[PDB]
Amino acid sequence: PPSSPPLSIMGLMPLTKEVAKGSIGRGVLPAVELAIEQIRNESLLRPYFLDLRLYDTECDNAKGLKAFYDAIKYGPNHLMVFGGVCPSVTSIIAESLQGWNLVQLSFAATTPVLADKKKYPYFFRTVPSDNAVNPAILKLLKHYQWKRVGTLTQDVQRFSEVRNDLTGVLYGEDIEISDTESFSNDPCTSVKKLKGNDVRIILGQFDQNMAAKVFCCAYEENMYGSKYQWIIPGWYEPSWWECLRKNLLAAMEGYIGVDFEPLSSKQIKTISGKTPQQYEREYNNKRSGVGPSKFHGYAYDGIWVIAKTLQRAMETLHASSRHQRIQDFNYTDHTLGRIILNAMNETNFFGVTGQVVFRNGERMGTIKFTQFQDSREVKVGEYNAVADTLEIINDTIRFQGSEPPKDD
Amino acid sequence: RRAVYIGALFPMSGGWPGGQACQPAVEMALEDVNSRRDILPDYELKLIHHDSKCDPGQATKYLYELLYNDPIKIILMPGCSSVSTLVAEAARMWNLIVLSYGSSSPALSNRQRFPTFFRTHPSATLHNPTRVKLFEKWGWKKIATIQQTTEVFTSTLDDLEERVKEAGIEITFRQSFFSDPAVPVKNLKRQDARIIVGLFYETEARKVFCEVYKERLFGKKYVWFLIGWYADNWFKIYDPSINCTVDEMTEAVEGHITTEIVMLNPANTRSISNMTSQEFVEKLTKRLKRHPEETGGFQEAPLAYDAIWALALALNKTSRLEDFNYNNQTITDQIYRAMNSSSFEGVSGHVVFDASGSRMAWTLIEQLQGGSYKKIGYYDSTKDDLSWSKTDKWIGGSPPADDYKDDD
Numbered sequence A: 001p002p003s004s005p006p007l008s009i010m011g012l013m014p015l016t017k018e019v020a021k022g023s024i025g026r027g028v029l030p031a032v033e034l035a036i037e038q039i040r041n042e043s044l045l046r047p048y049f050l051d052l053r054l055y056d057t058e059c060d061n062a063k064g065l066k067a068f069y070d071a072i073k074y075g076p077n078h079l080m081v082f083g084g085v086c087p088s089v090t091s092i093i094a095e096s097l098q099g100w101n102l103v104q105l106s107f108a109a110t111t112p113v114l115a116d117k118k119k120y121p122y123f124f125r126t127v128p129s130d131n132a133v134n135p136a137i138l139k140l141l142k143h144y145q146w147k148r149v150g151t152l153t154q155d156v157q158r159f160s161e162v163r164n165d166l167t168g169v170l171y172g173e174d175i176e177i178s179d180t181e182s183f184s185n186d187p188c189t190s191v192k193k194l195k196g197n198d199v200r201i202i203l204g205q206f207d208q209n210m211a212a213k214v215f216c217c218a219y220e221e222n223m224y225g226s227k228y229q230w231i232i233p234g235w236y237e238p239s240w241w242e243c244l245r246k247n248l249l250a251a252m253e254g255y256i257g258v259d260f261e262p263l264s265s266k267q268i269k270t271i272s273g274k275t276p277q278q279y280e281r282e283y284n285n286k287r288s289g290v291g292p293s294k295f296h297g298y299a300y301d302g303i304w305v306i307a308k309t310l311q312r313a314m315e316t317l318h319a320s321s322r323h324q325r326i327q328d329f330n331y332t333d334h335t336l337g338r339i340i341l342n343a344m345n346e347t348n349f350f351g352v353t354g355q356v357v358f359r360n361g362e363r364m365g366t367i368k369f370t371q372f373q374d375s376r377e378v379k380v381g382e383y384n385a386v387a388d389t390l391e392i393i394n395d396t397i398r399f400q401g402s403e404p405p406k407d408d
Numbered sequence B: 001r002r003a004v005y006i007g008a009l010f011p012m013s014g015g016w017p018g019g020q021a022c023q024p025a026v027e028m029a030l031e032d033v034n035s036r037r038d039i040l041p042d043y044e045l046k047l048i049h050h051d052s053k054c055d056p057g058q059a060t061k062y063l064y065e066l067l068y069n070d071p072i073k074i075i076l077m078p079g080c081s082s083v084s085t086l087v088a089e090a091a092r093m094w095n096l097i098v099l100s101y102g103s104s105s106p107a108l109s110n111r112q113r114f115p116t117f118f119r120t121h122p123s124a125t126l127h128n129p130t131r132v133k134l135f136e137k138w139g140w141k142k143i144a145t146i147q148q149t150t151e152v153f154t155s156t157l158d159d160l161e162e163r164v165k166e167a168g169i170e171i172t173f174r175q176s177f178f179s180d181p182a183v184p185v186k187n188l189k190r191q192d193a194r195i196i197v198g199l200f201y202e203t204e205a206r207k208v209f210c211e212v213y214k215e216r217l218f219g220k221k222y223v224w225f226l227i228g229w230y231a232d233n234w235f236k237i238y239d240p241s242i243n244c245t246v247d248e249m250t251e252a253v254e255g256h257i258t259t260e261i262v263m264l265n266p267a268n269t270r271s272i273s274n275m276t277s278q279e280f281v282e283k284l285t286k287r288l289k290r291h292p293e294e295t296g297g298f299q300e301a302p303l304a305y306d307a308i309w310a311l312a313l314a315l316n317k318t319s320r321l322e323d324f325n326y327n328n329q330t331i332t333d334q335i336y337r338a339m340n341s342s343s344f345e346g347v348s349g350h351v352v353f354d355a356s357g358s359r360m361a362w363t364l365i366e367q368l369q370g371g372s373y374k375k376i377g378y379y380d381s382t383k384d385d386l387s388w389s390k391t392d393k394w395i396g397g398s399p400p401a402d403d404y405k406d407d408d
C-alpha cells in the first residue's frame, strides 16, 4: 500500500557468484522471501511493512565494512541489521553496532567469541554457536558413563574458546579431563602424549584441514578401534575426507561429530502455522537457480524474530510517540536501540529450527550428533538445550567392540 | 598555504593507552613541520583526531566520520595493532595510505593484505631473536606459551615457533584465551611448565598473574617472559576483575623477564628536527600534564613524532595535494613510492620503510626485582651482540631448569 510505511532492515551477507560463500546468501534468500511473504499477507506489522534491503559483503572484511558504511550513508533509516555470515566480517559489524544504536541478528555466524556481551552487546544469533556443543557432549558422556576424557585443541581462538568453555560446563559434574593437549600445525606430538596418558575418550576442537592430520596421527599411534571414542566438530564439509585413504578411514571409523541441527524433527505447527516438514518442501519449491543452504531454517526463523521484535517495539499506549520515534530514527537514538534490544531479548516462539529463545544473545537450540560409519555420516542423536535432554536414535550408533569403550 | 588533512586515531585508554603521549608528540611534530619553509611551503598539515580507546568497535565509528565527512584526508594515522589492522585492511576501498606510529602486529608486514600500509613502530618479531638468545644463554630447550588471542600476539607466536625450531628449541605446551586466562593457567600448572612466554596487553596481564598467584605458578622453578610495554607499577594497580591483593600480585610477578625495543637514539646527535633525543624528552615532558612514568605511550612517542616527519617529507617529494580523492589511485601510488624511498634521521634513529621488520637493531631486557624493574641487558640481533649488565638475580644464585632431568 502507498500509505504503508517501511520498517527498514539492513541485510548483510555474501551474494556474488565471484565468492564461494555467495552460495550461502543466495541459498537462504528463498527462506527469507517465504517468511517476508507470509508476514505481509498476514499484515502482522500493520500499517507498516518489513523493508529488508540487501547489501553484499562479498565475504570480505574491506568490502563488508564499506557495504555497511554505504548502507548507513546512502540507504534508508535501518532499524536493525540482519545477517553476518563470514565470521571476520560479522565480528567487524557486530563490535561496532553501538555506534549506530543497531541491534544485529545473524543466522549463520557460529564462532564462540561473538557470545562476549562486553564486546558484542547488541548482537543476537538464531544459530547455536560452536560452544553449544559442550552441554550436549556432557549429556553424551553421562549417557555412556564416560567419566574420564582427554582434549585435543588447535591453538586458534575459535577452538581454544570452545575448549576453555568446556571446563565450565563440566564443573560440578563428575568428569575428569585427565590430559589437555594443544597443537599449532602438527598434532602428532600431542596425539602421542594422549596415547602415553592412556586417554580413551577424546574431545577434539580443530579445523577441517587439521582433522585429516589428527586421524593420520591416531592411525600411526593405533588410537582407534573398539578401545577409543573420538568426539569432534560436525560442521566440516560433507565428504571432507575425500596417510593412504584406507588407513585414514580405519582411524575415522565410529568418530562422533557434533553440530547444530538444521531443522526441527518435531511435526508440530510452528508460528507460521506450518510444520518444519511443510516449510522444508515450500523452501525446496521456492529456490530456483541455487543449491540449498544448511542455514535456511535459521534465516527463516531469523525473519520471524525481527517481525516479532518490531511488533513488541510497537506495543505501547504511547502509540503516536512510538511511531514518530521509529520514523525519526537516524542511528542516534539510544532509547529506540534499547527498546529494540529489550524486545529481541523477550523472543520466545516455536520456529522451524525448534523453540526460538535466547540466553544473553545466544540461541538455546538443538544440537545434532552424527557418527562416521563407512564413508557416511549417520545422524545418531539430538540434544535440546532448553530441556537439557539427549535423545539417542535407536539402532544407529554403533561400537566396534561388544560394548561401548571404557574411559580407562 | 592550502590545508592538507590527516585523519588520526589515538588510544587514550584500552589495551595500549599510547595516545596519552603520542597525541602531544604528533602536535609537536606538526608545529615543527609547518614552521619549516623548506619542507611543504605551499601546504599546511592539519590534524583531525579521535580517541579510539584502543577499540576496533569505537574506531569503526570514527573511521566512518573521517571518510564520509569533508574535508578529504590524504592519510590515516592509527595507533593500536587492532585498530591499525582494521583501518589498513579497509583503506584500499578509499585508496588511502595508512601510517601507524604504534602498531607492532607482525601480520601487518603482509603487503597483499595491507597494500597501502607503513609504520614507524618495529614489528613485534624483534622480541623473538632476543627471547631465543636468552633461552640459549640459560640452556632451555623446552618452553611453554600463553597468549591472549589478538592477532598482534598470535602472529608474534607464529614467528617465535619458527625461530625456536631453527635453534633446536621446542614449544612443548600452548594455551590461549580471549578474555579469561583461568583455564590456560590451570593447565600450565598441571603440565609442569617451567619457562613460559606470556603475550597479552597490560589489562590481561593482571588477570593472568592473579591466576598465577592462585595456582602458585611462580617461585624458584618458574620463569615468566613478558612484553616490556606495561606501566612500571602495572601489577600494583587496583583491578575490579581481579580478587588478588597488591601484595599477592607483587609476589606472583617477582623475578619475571621483559623485552622491549629501544625507540629513542641513545647517542647525543641532532636529528632532522635539529633536536637531540634528550631535548625531545624534556620538550614532551613540558607538554604533558602527568609525569612520563604516568603517561601511556611515552616510550613510543618518538615514533609518533617521526611518523609526521616521514609523511611531511613524502608529501614534499610528491609536491597537486588539494586534488586528492578516494576514487583515484594516482596520488596514492606516488605518495606510496615517496614513503617507500624514505631515508632520514629522526628522534628514533634512521627512519626507513621496508615491510617485514620495521628497522632498528636493539631490544632492552629487564627483570622485576623487589617490585621494581632493573635493566639486565640489551640485544642486537643484526650483529648478534648481547650486552650483559650482570645485574640479574635468581633464587639460589642461578636460573632454574626447563624440566626435571633426574627420572632415569
Ligand SMILES: *[C@@H]1O[C@H](CO)[C@@H](O)[C@H](O)[C@H]1NC(C)=O
Pocket (backbone or CB within 6 Å): A342, A345, A346
Ligand atoms: C532479558 O531476558 C531475560 C530472560 O527472560 C531476563 O531475565 C532479563 O531480565 C532480560 N534483560 C533485560 C530486561 O534487561
Ligand SMILES: NC[C@H](CC(=O)O)c1ccc(Cl)cc1
Pocket (backbone or CB within 6 Å): B015, B016, B018, B079, B080, B081, B082, B102, B103, B104, B105, B152, B200, B201, B202, B227, B229, B230, B300
Ligand atoms: N608498543 C606499543 C604496542 C601497541 C600495539 O601493537 O597495539 C604494544 C605491543 C604490545 C603490548 Cl603488550 C603493548 C603495546
